[PDB]
Amino acid sequence: FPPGHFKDPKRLYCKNGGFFLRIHPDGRVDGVREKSDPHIKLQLQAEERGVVSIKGVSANRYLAMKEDGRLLASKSVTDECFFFERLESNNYNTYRSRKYTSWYVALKRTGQYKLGSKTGPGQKAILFLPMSAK
């Protein structure tokens, strides 16, 4: 079986541009390419089958997608901090908001996130490859 263990913290690498998902201490959400960045070590936790929360370890905040589709990290877990985790046929993972069921966690090729309202299944901005935290 492949190395990694499910409870270990991970980095979420985005096919689009090769940015790692980063969660800032002030709740800001974006992506970077520097693997050493301390705000990209995340902790995934299943709340129920196929559904998870994504916590930026350092920022000690949870990834969340607001009503408008904007992405941010809140100190307190709410119902907007849950995403359906799916391992697509292409072997990448997608994180679809459980609250706003058609919006995906994603990153623009610029390194900035992409509004959930502007994402779609066929897109490349929504594809993430989970990786070890070194």
Binding site: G18, C81, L87, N91
Partner: protein, 200 residues
């Protein structure tokens, strides 16, 4: 107008680290220009990259200044450098390749766990459960009372960090019965049951 080599599309080169799921094709590009037409070489970890360095070798489409590796595997991990040059200069760019193997299966538990347990009333007891899964798994412990009762369930408040082990202090004749560790992910569900026997 004779000039040294230069990158004609730095946009396609910004993404330095290429992490892809195993079995996929990787194409590294270094679009160049310069007069005369610069040549191109590829290095793997600073050394010449030969067809025998990986099963199946690789392909190169000079026309697109690209390096192509099909069905990548973990051992392909490493640095790939393109070296372009002509009589007026030499420039290089390095990409890092990282391969990740996916494991598309429903959760798998270790045979034998949780194990059956025995104890006299008032005694302490535990059930361990080892789970392996790629997609994030959801684990919960259930007691049969099919009348089922969730004793513990993973979540933001009950981290995986300690969800794999279930303790029962000062057990009573009530506690006896069949305990189950159930793990599930988007693909499917799996579970192993153990039996707790309480003695007088």
């Amino acid at each position: 107008n004779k000039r040294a080599p230069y990158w004609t599309n730095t946009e396609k080169m910004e993404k330095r680290l290429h992490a892809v799921p195993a079995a996929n094709t990787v194409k590294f590009r270094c679009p160049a220009g310069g007069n005369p037409m610069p040549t191109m070489r590829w290095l793997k970890n600073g050394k010449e990259f030969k067809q025998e360095h990986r099963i199946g070798g690789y392909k190169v489409r000079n026309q697109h200044w690209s390096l192509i590796m099909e069905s990548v595997v973990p051992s392909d991990k490493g640095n790939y450098t393109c070296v372009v040059e002509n009589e007026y200069g030499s420039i290089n760019h390095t990409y890092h390749l990282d391969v990740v193997e996916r494991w598309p299966h429903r959760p798998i538990l270790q045979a034998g766990l949780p194990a059956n347990a025995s104890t006299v009333v008032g005694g302490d007891v535990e059930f361990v459960c080892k789970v392996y899964s790629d997609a994030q798994p959801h684990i919960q412990w259930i007691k049969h009372v099919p009348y089922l009762k969730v004793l513990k369930a993973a979540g933001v408040n009950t981290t995986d960090k300690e969800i794999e082990v279930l303790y029962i202090r000062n057990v009573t004749f009530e506690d006896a019965g069949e305990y189950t560790c159930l793990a599930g992910n988007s693909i499917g569900i799996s579970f192993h049951s153990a039996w707790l026997t309480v003695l007088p």
